């Protein structure tokens, strides 16, 4: 698919590049930025730009662009997936992936580019395996590259074998202007830190409703996963048969699976802001925020982002709990509550001054968004029931786990 891959700077000029097929003039990239800016003004912005029979698939990461040229009916899904993968790899090779990183690591970046993709076909893209022969600090290729287990090399030894599971659930929410829930869903992620010796076989036990129903546990508490996505390491075919999450885990940190399910509960944090606007004079926000979960549980570091006019001035805040700050750079106020226990209802009021002469351009009306975090909590009621570790040497290896619920796209429309 990809004929060439470029890493570009904010003005569109090449920081680094790799020509894979020779299908396209590299100089074509000179048209990337001008076309982009052109199409953006037209409101025709697109992940795919065209200069004749040349296509640019591009993403933007920090102050960089990653662009892939193709003169063919390219597999776009693969290209984007690949670009993001390159971002990940670079992110794991260099701490911060930015222009300075590119410039200062051009060598090893050239190596990585020549190893990641061949002739437009992604090859080895696992940074932890890549790091075995593309090193910062003559080797021969790890068999892992060409092994059925391509994400974990043999030879790994820990003196203290242990496994960590982070069950992290994000709650997406979308509330209509009137205040009735348009959408709400739970997006889950199981992130593991695997410190095990050898090539262990791991098996995850969840209260997967489908599993329970097929084992006469329908009466017991379960969770109905609308969809599940698994890391490469998981044996997909076995899950398909009997809901078995079997895998030989890669070394260190990785995301095992993501899931998605609907919610049957009131939104964890409910915002209600009413607005009284006196045109050409002032605007007032009266907003209550109530935590709708068990009082035993507590939400941390909650911020309630409320858009305010772009020409507002002289703010005045009063709260029952927490502080407010005006963030003009984002044309909003942020109500911050450090510790928010369940079943509480807090209050906030904001008063702004408005210009006597109206604005020239209407500015737009973003929704209220909120960020929060509740430790030792799941809205889903999911439970990792067991984590079996199977090693030929049968060493003692104890797994650990914790549950965190936080915000995803958690936003309430305003009027």
């Amino acid at each position: 698919s990809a004929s060439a891959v470029y890493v570009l700077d904010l003005k569109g000029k090449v920081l680094i590049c790799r020509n894979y097929r020779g299908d396209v003039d590299m100089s074509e990239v000179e048209h990337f930025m001008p076309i982009l800016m052109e199409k953006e003004e037209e409101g025709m912005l697109s992940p795919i730009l065209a200069h004749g029979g040349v296509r640019f698939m591009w993403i933007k990461h920090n102050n960089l662009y990653l662009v892939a040229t193709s003169k063919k009916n390219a597999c776009v899904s693969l290209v984007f997936s690949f670009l993001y993968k390159v971002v990940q790899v670079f992110s794991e090779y260099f701490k911060e992936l930015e222009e300075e990183s590119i410039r200062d690591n051009f060598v090893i970046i050239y190596e990585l580019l020549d190893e990641l993709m061949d002739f437009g076909y992604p090859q080895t893209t696992d940074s932890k395996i890549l790091q075995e022969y593309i090193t910062q600090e003559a080797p021969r290729p790890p068999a892992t590259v060409t092994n059925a287990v391509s994400w974990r090399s043999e030879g790994i030894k820990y003196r203290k074998n242990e496994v960590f599971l982070d069950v992290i659930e994000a709650v997406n929410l979308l509330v209509s202007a009137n205040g009735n829930v348009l959408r709400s869903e739970i997006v889950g992620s199981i992130k593991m830190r695997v410190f095990l010796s050898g090539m262990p076989e791991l098996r995850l036990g969840l209260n997967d409703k489908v599993l329970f129903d097929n084992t006469g546990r329908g009466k017991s508490k379960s969770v109905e996963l609308e969809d599940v996505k698994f890391h490469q390491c998981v044996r997909l075919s076995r899950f398909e048969n009997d809901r078995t999450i079997s895998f030989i885990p890669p070394d260190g940190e990785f995301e095992l699976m993501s899931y998605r399910l609907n919610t049957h509960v009131k939104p964890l944090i409910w915002i209600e802001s009413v607005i009284e606007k006196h045109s050409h004079s002032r605007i007032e926000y009266m907003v209550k925020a109530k935590s709708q979960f068990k009082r035993r549980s507590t939400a941390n570091n909650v911020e309630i982002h409320i858009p305010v006019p772009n020409d507002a001035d002289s703010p005045k805040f009063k709260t029952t709990v927490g502080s407010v700050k005006w963030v003009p750079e984002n044309s909003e106020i942020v109500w911050s509550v450090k510790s928010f226990p369940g079943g509480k209802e807090y209050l906030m009021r904001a008063h702004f001054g408005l210009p006597s002469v109206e604005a020239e351009d209407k500015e737009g009306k973003p929704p209220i968004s909120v960020k929060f975090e509740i430790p030792y909590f799941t809205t889903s009621g999911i439970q990792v029931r067991y984590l079996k570790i199977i090693e030929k040497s049968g060493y003692q290896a104890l797994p650990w786990v914790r549950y965190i619920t936080q915000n995803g796209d958690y936003q309430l429309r305003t009027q």
Partner: peptide
């Protein structure tokens, strides 16, 4: 990564 880990059975 500040919160506590519970143990999980190898059942």
């Amino acid at each position: 990564t500040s919160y506590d880990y519970c143990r999980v059975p190898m059942e």
